[model samples]
Target: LHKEPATLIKAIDGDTVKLMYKGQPMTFRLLLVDTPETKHPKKGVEKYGPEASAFTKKMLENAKKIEVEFDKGQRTDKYGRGLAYIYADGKMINEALVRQGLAKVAYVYKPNNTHEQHLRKSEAQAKKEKLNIWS
Candidate 1:
């Protein structure tokens, strides 16, 4: 639970965000989850992508507190994106997104992974409930 304080500068999409960390702007991939593509250089717009983006934007907008946490696994990726567990409203933003079925668990990446079990469990619940993207 390496919690580092941050401010959400932008919710670029459901799976990515820009934040002000220690007063410097930075962007990172939300750890442990993948979201629909609002804009992928290759994939372009995917179904429900816009809704995912809007949901994230709303989540952040309503978040009174936002921080970044790193798990025991990797901190940054080869793609130059930092990895983080978004701490929002006393909860994990990544977990919230998945629980709402706005995102999917990134089970492939195991290094530097934290809260993997919780995330998978949330995904299972979301799937069973047929929420949003799961529907």
Candidate 2:
């Protein structure tokens, strides 16, 4: 009965989430997206930051089941945290975050660009609407 189990617990922000996997709790930073830092005190708040977080929370609310998939030959990031693509009801939360103007594409090391194209398109749409953090 041992299997990789994952479920959405809470959304810390638009781009960050708390997940439960295999009876262990973990945090997942939505890959290829960057949301405003709600935890930062000194940092100037971004526009639509709270709206983004609330949107994400709404998406994850009542989600009792989720699926996770990892990139081939790639597992964890520099923080020693597992990196994965999170899905709920076959919808990709990662891509959705950007498409909804809740986040922008971001990559820390060499880009693991599975959704790069999609991310670019999403960011363009947000920009067109002047939905940037500074705006």
Candidate 3:
């Protein structure tokens, strides 16, 4: 995994973000997590998309500083965006998204699922806890 220092430029949705890393623009898609679709050319916003987007925005905007970790999987998912785990205030956004039930575990069965077990466990726990998105 490679770490890139990031400044949160904007939250594109729940699972994607636009950042300026060391003065360079970049897009980061959270790895192994998928939030509700906030925008679609055909479908528009899907169910729960607003809540997911709000949660992500709140989290990112409140961050003192953010860092991005690029995993071993394919750099991006056909979109050419960087795949990463965002860390802010000592928390990993990838796990937090699933753990808080703002997103779901979406492991792609890639050989290098660095935090598969932890993410799955957090998702299960959030499911049991019935966080906002769980309903």
Candidate 4:
């Protein structure tokens, strides 16, 4: 429940987002999920990357309320981007992506893995249904 309301600037990619938080621009890397890379210079466009990105963009763009949650652990990644769980219109964006198999639970470290179980359950369901990356 440690969350801060923000305005969605845009989604940079599937797993990365831009927001106006507290009158400042902030970049957030969605915690515990890694989607395929659509803008990675070295990786090129990975399979299903575009779909994931589009999904995130649509969700955020349509959301009337946006919030970012931080775990009890480290709040930022090495790149200085905030590590967070995104909520759009009260729906958990990270878990939704996992449920649709657009992302996989990853970078799980202690404390920061607060929603690891929730994500894994959604991923399991996605796998059971053979969705996207789980197919």
Instruction: Identify the leading candidate in terms of TM-score.
Output: 4
Instruction: For candidate 3, give the lDDT of residue 27.
Output: 85
lDDT to native, each model: 0.85, 0.70, 0.83, 0.92
Q: What stretches of model 1 exceed 4 Å from their correct place?
A: none
Q: Please, what are the lDDT tens digits per residue for candidate 1 over residues 1-135?
A: 768888878889888888898888888898889899988678899987888788878878788888788777777788877788887788888888899998999865766666888889999999999998889
| Higher-scoring candidate on lDDT, 1 or 4 | 4
* Model 2, residue 118: C-alpha shift (Å): 1.9
Rank list by lDDT: 4, 1, 3, 2
Q: How displaced is residue 20 in candidate 2, in Å? A: 1.2
Order of quality (TM-score): 4, 1, 3, 2
- What lDDT score goes with residue 23 in model 3? 85
Q: How close to the true structure is residue 2 of candidate 1, measured as C-alpha lDDT?
A: 66
Expressed as tens digits, the lDDT of each residue in 1-135 for candidate 3 is 766678988898988899997788888888888888989877689777787888778888999878888777677767778887888876888888788888888856575488888899999999999986786
RMSD of 3: 1.7
TM match of model 2 to true structure: 0.78
Worst 10 residues of 4 by lDDT: 1-10
* Candidate with best lDDT: 4
lDDT of 1: 0.85
Error of 1 at 98 (Å): 0.8
Residue-wise C-alpha lDDT for candidate 2, range 33-120, written one tens digit per residue: 7777666777656667787788778777755657776655356767766676777766777777777667778863444566678778
